[PDB]
Structure formats: C-alpha cells, structure tokens
Amino acid sequence: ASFPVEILPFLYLGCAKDSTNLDVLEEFGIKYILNVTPNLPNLFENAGEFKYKQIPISDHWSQNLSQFFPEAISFIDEARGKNCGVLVHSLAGISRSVTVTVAYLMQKLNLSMNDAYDIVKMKKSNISPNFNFMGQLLDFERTL
Ligand SMILES: [Cl-]
C-alpha cells in the first residue's frame, strides 16, 4: 500500500507501516539498510543483495540516540556517495528513523533542526513523530 519516501536522492525513509519488500527495495536501487528498531544487537553484515546495519538502541528513557548519529551519518553518506539507495527504517514507528534522517540533513546540508525537519516535511507532509527526540536534535545542533 505505501512505500519508502525519497527525502534526498539515494536517501529513503520508511515508516513502520511501509512495504519493506525486497523486490521493492531492489527496484528503488536501495542496497543499504539502516535499522533503528530498538532492543536489537549491534550488527553490520551483508544480507542477500544488501548491506544491513542494526544499531543497539534501547527503548529505555535514558537511551541516547544521538551518540549513534556519527556512525549513522557515515553509513548513509557512504551509500549516497556510491550512488546507492540507503533506507532508514524502524519497525517501532517513525520517530527514530526521521530523527536519524533529520540529523543527517542537519550535518550534510548544514541546516538547523527546524530547517532540516521542514525539508523532510516537503517530501513526506503526512509524517507525525513524537517529541522524544527534540532535545537530542537541538543539542546536536549546537555540535555544528
Ligand atoms: Cl521508532
């Protein structure tokens, strides 16, 4: 019914309720998958035709997602550099994925959290995240 949206060329954001079918991904030229679903072990291996990455996030309130920004950005960038689609996805919702996406836009395009988020809303105006990551994104903004 619904598919991952291309935020920037080669950068895809998938909502939990999106069709993560392998054929659909091959068709979009997506070869890299960044899974930000919580409570999973750290992994980075090749899975079929894809380079699968899974970061060790915890859904506990004390968990800091921002610390994974550098490695997430490096992964997304390495994919886009090689002209390969990269997918940021979470089975738990849209919040962690859009947060990693916004962080990437902030650093890559040299934008503030608000500007980067507005860019995301241009391509996916329906998006409705929670506010659990405002503080981390605002804090990450200072880093730039
Ligand atoms: Cl999430």
The DSSP 8-state label assigned to residue 64 in this structure reads -
Place of tokens 């392998």: 22
Distance from the alpha carbon of residue 16 to the mean position of ligand 1, in angstroms: 8
Distance 133 CA to ligand 1 centre (A): 10
Interatomic CA distance for residues 1 and 18, integer angstroms: 7
Q: How many other CB atoms are found less than 10 A from the CB of residue 108?
A: 15
Q: What is the resolution of this structure in A?
A: 2.3
Ligand 1: distance of its center to the CA of 15 in Å? 9
3-state helix, strand, coil in the chain (%, to 5): 40, 20, 40
The method recorded for this entry reads X-ray
Q: What CATH code is carried by the domain that includes residue 22?
A: 3.90.190.10
The residues near 10 (Cβ < 8 Å, ≥ 6 apart) are: 29, 79, 80, 83, 84, 85, 86
**CA 97 to centroid of ligand 1, rounded, Å:** 6
In 3-state terms, what secondary structure has residue 119? Answer: helix
Whole-number Å distance, alpha carbon 29 to ligand 1 midpoint, is 24
In the chain, the number of structural domains is 1
CA distance 121 to 85: 20
Residue 21 lies in domain: 1-144
